[PDB]
Enzyme design. Sequence first.
Site, PDB file in Angstrom:
ATOM      1  N   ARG A 179     -37.798 -24.612 -31.887  1.00 26.20           N
ATOM      2  CA  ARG A 179     -37.064 -25.051 -30.687  1.00 26.20           C
ATOM      3  C   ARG A 179     -36.336 -26.329 -30.993  1.00 26.20           C
ATOM      4  NH1 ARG A 179     -41.520 -24.221 -25.849  1.00 26.20           N
ATOM      5  NH2 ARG A 179     -41.649 -21.933 -26.103  1.00 26.20           N
ATOM      6  N   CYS A 230     -36.052 -22.278 -25.863  1.00 25.91           N
ATOM      7  CA  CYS A 230     -37.257 -21.454 -25.552  1.00 25.91           C
ATOM      8  C   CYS A 230     -37.730 -20.440 -26.573  1.00 25.91           C
ATOM      9  CB  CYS A 230     -36.990 -20.819 -24.198  1.00 25.91           C
ATOM     10  SG  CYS A 230     -37.255 -22.066 -22.973  1.00 25.91           S
ATOM     11  N   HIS A 279     -32.855 -20.843 -22.151  1.00 27.53           N
ATOM     12  CA  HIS A 279     -32.672 -19.939 -23.285  1.00 27.53           C
ATOM     13  C   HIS A 279     -31.400 -20.277 -24.047  1.00 27.53           C
ATOM     14  CE1 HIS A 279     -35.958 -17.269 -22.575  1.00 27.53           C
ATOM     15  NE2 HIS A 279     -35.561 -16.972 -21.350  1.00 27.53           N
TER      16      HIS A 279
END
Length: 152
Positions: free
Chosen positions: A130, A125, A56
């Site tokens: 991304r 993520c 993340h």
Amino acid sequence: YTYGKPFAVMYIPRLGFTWNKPVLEGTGTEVLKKGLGHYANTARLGQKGNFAVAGHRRTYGDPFKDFPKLRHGDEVVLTDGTTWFTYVIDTGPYKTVPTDVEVIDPVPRKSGYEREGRYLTLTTCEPSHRLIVWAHLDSTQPVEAGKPEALR
């Protein structure tokens, strides 16, 4: 590797000397809350193929907060407790869409690699775009030899 359990630790000097994250097997939503997650269908650490890891950027500790600072030639270093693996970034950060699943294939089209090797992929993520980097294995050494050059 055992789903949901840690198997390695990652260090990336670009993201800070003290940056250190556990890598767990799997990419279920609950894994990514505890650390970085290894795509379970991809190669194991140091192996031929593409060792792919998700993290993340903006939630749950933001391990990949500074992903945009990664550059070609930056090292990504892992230990499994026995061996230190030093990977070197060749491509990215590359902006793509969440549905672009080919980025974790053994020889990803967008990596620039044109043959089998011992690769590593990092992805952020976002469920927005991304970011991806691709790297190849440069060196190994035993944990008896101490920390590798990348971490000194």
